[PDB]
Structures are given as C-alpha cells and as structure tokens.
C-alpha cells in the first residue's frame, strides 16, 4: 500500500481463481498494473519483457515451482532485486527457512484478506526501504 500504486505486479499461481483472487484484492488496495504467470517458466518469460516491480508467487506450481522460480530471479543480473512474496497453503518451519535463504522478500499463507496482504506488502516495502 506503499504510494507508487502503477508499480507493475505479475502474480504467479497454476490455479486461475487464485491469480484472480490475488487480482482482485490488489485492485482493492489500488494497484491495477497486474499480469499474470501459470508456472515459472510462464513468469520467467513475463519477466524477460521488463518493467516488472513486484512478485507475488505460489510455492506449489508444476514444472517450475515458487522457490525455482524465485532462484532464477534472484540470480539474474537485472531482474536481482525484484521483490518476491511466496504464497502457500501451509506454513512450514523447512519451506520458510529455504524460502529466506533463497531470497524470498516475504511469505503468506492462502486464504488471506486484502488488510493481510496490504500488511505483507507495507513490510516488504519498509524491510527494503521502498
Ligand atoms: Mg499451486
């Protein structure tokens, strides 16, 4: 909820009704400059185009997952410092442990409301001084 509101999201899940939700609760809080991935070589392919500003990520994707996915833009040069909020059904000690040492920005778990994710959002934000 951070002021830039065209800042450019593209959120990532292999179910469309989550990507619609996760949509939906970023146009409440007035971000409407959002695209959408299936999996992560679909994101990967999104991102290359460029201007992207913030990712918001499902762990549990076929082919590529959320935390493959967040290693590949964490190692490229342009895309490095990209914010990443992983999104799953269950937290668990292990995935957030090797989500944090992967460079996740953040995690939340599903089902969430739109003060949840804005409160994700403004951490990040303040964690890295945005
Ligand atoms: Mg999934």
Redesign the pocket.
């Known amino acids: 909820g951070m002021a830039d509101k065209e800042l450019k999201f593209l959120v990532v899940?292999?179910?469309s009704t989550?990507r619609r939700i996760v949509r939906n609760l970023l146009k409440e809080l007035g971000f409407n400059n959002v695209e959408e991935a299936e999996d992560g070589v679909d994101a990967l392919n999104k991102l290359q185009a460029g201007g992207y500003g913030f990712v918001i990520s499902?762990?549990?994707?076929p082919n590529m997952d959320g935390l493959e996915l967040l290693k590949t833009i964490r190692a490229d040069g342009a895309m490095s410092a990209l914010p990443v909020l992983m999104v799953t059904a269950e937290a668990k000690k292990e995935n957030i442990i090797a989500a944090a040492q992967a460079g996740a920005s953040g995690y939340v778990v599903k089902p969430f409301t739109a003060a949840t994710l804005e409160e994700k959002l403004n951490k990040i934000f303040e964690k890295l001084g945005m």
């Open positions: 899940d292999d179910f989550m499902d762990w549990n994707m």
